[PDB]
Tab-separated table of C-alpha atoms and ligand atoms in Angstrom:
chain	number	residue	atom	x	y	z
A	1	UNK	CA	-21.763	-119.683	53.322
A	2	UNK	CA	-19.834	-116.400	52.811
A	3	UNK	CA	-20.044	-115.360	56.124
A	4	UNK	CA	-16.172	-115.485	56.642
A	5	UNK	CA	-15.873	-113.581	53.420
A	6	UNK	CA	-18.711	-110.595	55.324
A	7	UNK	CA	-16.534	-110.753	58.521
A	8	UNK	CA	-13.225	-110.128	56.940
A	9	UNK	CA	-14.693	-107.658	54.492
A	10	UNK	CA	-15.810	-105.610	58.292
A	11	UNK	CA	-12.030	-106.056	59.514
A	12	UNK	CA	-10.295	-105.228	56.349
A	13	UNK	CA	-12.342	-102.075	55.710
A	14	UNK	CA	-11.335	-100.709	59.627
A	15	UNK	CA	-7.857	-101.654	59.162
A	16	UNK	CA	-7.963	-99.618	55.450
A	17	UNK	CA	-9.293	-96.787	57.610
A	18	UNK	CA	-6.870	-97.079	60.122
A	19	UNK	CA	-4.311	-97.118	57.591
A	20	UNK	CA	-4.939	-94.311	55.845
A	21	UNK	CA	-4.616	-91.678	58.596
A	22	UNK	CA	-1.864	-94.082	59.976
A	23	UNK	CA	0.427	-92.910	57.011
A	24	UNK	CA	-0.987	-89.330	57.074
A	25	UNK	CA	0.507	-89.114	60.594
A	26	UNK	CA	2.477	-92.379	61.805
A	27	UNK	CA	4.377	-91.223	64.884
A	28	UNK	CA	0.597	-91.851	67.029
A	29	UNK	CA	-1.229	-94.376	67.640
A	30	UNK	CA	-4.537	-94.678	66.215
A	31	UNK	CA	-7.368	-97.250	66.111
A	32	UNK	CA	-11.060	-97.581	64.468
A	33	UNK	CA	-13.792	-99.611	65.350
A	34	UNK	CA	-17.355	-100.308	64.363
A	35	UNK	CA	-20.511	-99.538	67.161
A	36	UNK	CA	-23.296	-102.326	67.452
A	37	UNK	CA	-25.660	-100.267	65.060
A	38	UNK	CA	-23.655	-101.500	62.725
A	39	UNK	CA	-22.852	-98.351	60.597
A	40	UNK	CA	-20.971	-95.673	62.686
A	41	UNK	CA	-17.357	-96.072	62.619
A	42	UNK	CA	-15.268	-94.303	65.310
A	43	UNK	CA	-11.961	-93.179	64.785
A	44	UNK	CA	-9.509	-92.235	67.640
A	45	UNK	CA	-5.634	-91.314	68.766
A	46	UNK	CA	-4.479	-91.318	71.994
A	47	UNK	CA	-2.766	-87.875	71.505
A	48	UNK	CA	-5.370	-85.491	73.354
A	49	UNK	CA	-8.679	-87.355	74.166
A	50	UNK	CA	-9.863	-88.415	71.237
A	51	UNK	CA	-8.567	-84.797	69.852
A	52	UNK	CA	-7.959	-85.260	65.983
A	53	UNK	CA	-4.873	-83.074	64.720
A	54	UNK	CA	-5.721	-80.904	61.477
A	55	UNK	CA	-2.523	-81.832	59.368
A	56	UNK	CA	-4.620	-85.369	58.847
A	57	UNK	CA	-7.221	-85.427	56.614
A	58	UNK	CA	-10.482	-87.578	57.473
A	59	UNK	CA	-12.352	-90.692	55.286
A	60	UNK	CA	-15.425	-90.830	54.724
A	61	UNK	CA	-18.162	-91.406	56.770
A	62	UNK	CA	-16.355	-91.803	60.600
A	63	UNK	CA	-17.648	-90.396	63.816
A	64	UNK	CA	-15.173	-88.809	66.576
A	65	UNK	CA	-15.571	-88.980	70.279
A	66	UNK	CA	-17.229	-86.148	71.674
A	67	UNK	CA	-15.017	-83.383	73.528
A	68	UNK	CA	-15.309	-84.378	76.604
A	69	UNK	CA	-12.316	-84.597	79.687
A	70	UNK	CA	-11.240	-87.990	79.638
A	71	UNK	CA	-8.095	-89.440	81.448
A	72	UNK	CA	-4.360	-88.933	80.187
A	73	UNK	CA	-3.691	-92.817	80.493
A	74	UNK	CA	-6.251	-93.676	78.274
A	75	UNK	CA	-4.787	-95.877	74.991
A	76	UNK	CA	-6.926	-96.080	71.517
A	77	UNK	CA	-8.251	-99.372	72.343
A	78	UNK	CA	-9.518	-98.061	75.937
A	79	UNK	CA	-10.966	-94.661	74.388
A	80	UNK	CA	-13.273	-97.161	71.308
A	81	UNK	CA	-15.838	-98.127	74.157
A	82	UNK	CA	-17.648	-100.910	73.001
A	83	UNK	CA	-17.836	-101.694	69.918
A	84	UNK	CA	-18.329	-105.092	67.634
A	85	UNK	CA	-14.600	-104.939	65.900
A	86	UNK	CA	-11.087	-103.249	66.162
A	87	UNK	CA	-8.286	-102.376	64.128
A	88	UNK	CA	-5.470	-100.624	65.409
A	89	UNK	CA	-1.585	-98.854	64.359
A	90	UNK	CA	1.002	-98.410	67.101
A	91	UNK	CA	2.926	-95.017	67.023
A	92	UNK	CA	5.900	-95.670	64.455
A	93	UNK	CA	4.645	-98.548	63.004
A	94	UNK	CA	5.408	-98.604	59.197
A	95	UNK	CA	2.403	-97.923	57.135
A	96	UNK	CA	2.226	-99.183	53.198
A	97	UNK	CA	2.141	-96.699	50.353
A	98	UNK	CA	-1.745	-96.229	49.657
A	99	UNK	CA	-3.339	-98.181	46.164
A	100	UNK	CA	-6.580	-97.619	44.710
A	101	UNK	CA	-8.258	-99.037	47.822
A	102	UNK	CA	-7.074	-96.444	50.176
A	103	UNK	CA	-10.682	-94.523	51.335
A	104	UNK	CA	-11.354	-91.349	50.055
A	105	UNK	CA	-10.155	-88.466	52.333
A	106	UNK	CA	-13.761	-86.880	51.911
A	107	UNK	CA	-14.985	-87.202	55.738
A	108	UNK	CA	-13.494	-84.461	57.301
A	109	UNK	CA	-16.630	-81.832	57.360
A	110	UNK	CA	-18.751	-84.404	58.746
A	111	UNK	CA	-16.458	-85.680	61.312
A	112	UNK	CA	-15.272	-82.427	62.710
A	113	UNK	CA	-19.084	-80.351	62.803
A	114	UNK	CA	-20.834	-82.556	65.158
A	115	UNK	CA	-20.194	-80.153	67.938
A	116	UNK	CA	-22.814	-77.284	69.082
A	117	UNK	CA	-21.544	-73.806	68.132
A	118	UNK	CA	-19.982	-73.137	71.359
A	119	UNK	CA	-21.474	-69.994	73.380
A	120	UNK	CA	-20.098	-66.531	72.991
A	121	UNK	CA	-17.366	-68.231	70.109
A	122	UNK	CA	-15.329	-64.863	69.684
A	123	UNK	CA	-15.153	-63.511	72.940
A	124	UNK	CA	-14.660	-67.062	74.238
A	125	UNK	CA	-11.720	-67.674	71.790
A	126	UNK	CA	-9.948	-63.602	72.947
A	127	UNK	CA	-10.039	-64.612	76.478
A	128	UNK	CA	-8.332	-68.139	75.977
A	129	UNK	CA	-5.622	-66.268	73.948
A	130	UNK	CA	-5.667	-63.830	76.591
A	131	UNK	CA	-4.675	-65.968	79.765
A	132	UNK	CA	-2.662	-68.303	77.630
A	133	UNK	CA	1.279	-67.246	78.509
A	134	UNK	CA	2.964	-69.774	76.007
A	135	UNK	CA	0.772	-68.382	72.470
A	136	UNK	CA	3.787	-66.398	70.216
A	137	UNK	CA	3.309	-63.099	69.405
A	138	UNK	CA	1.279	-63.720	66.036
A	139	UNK	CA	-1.697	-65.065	68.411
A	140	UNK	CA	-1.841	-62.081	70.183
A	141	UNK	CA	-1.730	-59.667	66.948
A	142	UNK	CA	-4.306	-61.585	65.177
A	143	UNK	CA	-6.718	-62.978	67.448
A	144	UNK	CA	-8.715	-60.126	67.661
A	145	UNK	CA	-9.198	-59.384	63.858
A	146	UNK	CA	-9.653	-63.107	63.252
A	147	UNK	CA	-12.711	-62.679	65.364
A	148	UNK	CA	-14.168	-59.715	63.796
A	149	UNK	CA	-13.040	-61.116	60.321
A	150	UNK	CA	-11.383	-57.710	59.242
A	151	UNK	CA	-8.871	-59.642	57.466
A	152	UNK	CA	-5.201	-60.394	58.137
A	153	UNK	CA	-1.882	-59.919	55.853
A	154	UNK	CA	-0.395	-62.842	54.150
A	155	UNK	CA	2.467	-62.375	55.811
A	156	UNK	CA	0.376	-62.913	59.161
A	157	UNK	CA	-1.189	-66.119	57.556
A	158	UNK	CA	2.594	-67.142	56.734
A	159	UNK	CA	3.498	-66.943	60.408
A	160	UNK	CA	0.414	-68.291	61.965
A	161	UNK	CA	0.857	-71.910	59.574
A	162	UNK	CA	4.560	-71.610	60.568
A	163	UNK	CA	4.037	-71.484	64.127
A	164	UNK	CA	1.225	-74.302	63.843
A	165	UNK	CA	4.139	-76.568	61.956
A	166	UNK	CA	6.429	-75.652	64.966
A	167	UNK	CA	4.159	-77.257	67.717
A	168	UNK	CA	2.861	-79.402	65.652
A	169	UNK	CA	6.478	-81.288	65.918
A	170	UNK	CA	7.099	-79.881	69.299
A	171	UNK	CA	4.385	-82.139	70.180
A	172	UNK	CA	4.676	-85.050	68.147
A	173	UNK	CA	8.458	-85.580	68.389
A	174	UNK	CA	7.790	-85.280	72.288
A	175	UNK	CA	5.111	-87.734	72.481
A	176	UNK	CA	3.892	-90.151	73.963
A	177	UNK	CA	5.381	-87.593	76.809
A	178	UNK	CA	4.223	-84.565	75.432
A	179	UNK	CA	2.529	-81.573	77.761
A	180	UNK	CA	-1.224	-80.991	77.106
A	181	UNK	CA	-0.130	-77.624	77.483
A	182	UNK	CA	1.367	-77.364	73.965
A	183	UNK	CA	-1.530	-79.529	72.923
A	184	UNK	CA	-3.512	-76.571	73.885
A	185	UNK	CA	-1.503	-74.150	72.123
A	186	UNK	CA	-1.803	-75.711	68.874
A	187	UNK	CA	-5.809	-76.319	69.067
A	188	UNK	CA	-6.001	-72.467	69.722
A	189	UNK	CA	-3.346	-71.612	66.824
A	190	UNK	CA	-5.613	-73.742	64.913
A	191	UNK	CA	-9.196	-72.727	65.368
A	192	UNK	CA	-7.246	-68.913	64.557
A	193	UNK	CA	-6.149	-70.581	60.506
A	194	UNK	CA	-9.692	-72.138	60.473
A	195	UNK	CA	-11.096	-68.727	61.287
A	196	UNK	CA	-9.477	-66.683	58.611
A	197	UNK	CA	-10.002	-69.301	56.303
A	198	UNK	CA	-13.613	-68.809	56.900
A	199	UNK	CA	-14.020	-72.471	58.274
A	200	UNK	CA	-15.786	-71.367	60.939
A	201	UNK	CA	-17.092	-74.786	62.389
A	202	UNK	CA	-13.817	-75.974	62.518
A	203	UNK	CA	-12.972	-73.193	64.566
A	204	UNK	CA	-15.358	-74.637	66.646
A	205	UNK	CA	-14.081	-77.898	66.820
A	206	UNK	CA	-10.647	-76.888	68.114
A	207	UNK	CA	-12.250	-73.864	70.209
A	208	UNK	CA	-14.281	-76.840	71.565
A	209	UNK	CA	-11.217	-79.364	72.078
A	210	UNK	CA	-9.282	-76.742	74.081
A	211	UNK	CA	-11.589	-76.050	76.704
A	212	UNK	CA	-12.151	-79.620	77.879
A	213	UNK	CA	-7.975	-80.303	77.352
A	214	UNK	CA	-7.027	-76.956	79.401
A	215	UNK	CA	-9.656	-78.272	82.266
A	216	UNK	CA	-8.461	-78.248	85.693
A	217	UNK	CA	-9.255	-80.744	88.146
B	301	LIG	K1	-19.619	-93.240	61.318
């Protein structure tokens, strides 16, 4: 006696979450699913390890995966684990306008500061822009002062966000056969806009994400 009507409420409101970074960013594949402790929901794309892009905005109350190397091959239902129910979009799939049901893009704070301040941040973040060939030439200027927070012009800020678009389709329009190289490139453009923004733990979280994507063997 209303136990369907529980069970398809638990389905319906991972498919809802699914959905609603589905039409944020459609051209990837995404999938959520729901642990055995029955509360934390884990949300995933296949596009860098579990990796969450910054142009999508977050619901409420989900859990990422850990940055952590895990293998290129790996698909959305493969990188959920185990967990007690699935919902899923496949890259391209058409995604409804959202109603009044569509979950509140509030979880993005939570989601994104689960990671450890990661040791020596600044220094950490000049030497990846240091050995990284590929940045363009508003990386290089602005690393530097982005770490010592003397403040950049907007013109700077223009070209940073411009570049970020830029890869940001580079990527996406390549995938699912895009290089984790550019992937890399576009987590360190964006932990620089996080900095200057002062959103310094979300620096972190892409500062984080690039060292386990530019891992070598
Ligand atoms: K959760």
């Amino acid at each position: 006696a209303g136990a369907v009507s529980a069970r398809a409420a638990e389905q319906q409101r991972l498919q809802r979450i699914v959905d609603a970074v589905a039409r944020q960013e459609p051209r990837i594949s995404w999938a959520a699913g729901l642990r055995d402790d029955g509360t934390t929901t884990l949300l995933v794309t296949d596009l860098a390890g579990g990796w969450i892009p910054p142009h999508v905005r977050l619901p409420a109350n989900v859990t990422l995966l850990e940055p952590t190397a895990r293998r290129r091959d790996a698909d959305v239902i493969d990188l959920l684990g185990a967990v007690v129910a699935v919902a899923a979009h496949e890259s391209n799939t058409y995604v409804a306008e959202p109603g009044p049901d569509a979950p509140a893009l509030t979880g993005d704070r939570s989601a994104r500061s689960a990671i450890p301040k990661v040791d020596e941040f600044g220094p950490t973040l000049v030497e990846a822009v240091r050995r990284r060939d590929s940045l363009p030439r508003i990386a290089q200027a602005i690393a530097l002062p982005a770490v010592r927070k003397t403040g950049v012009l907007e013109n700077e800020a223009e070209l940073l966000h411009g570049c970020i678009t830029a890869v940001k389709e580079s990527v996406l329009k390549a995938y699912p056969s895009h290089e984790l190289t550019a992937v890399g490139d576009w987590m360190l453009l964006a932990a620089i806009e996080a900095l200057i923004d002062e959103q310094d733990y979300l620096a972190n979280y892409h500062l984080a994400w690039y060292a386990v994507t530019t891992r070598r063997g």
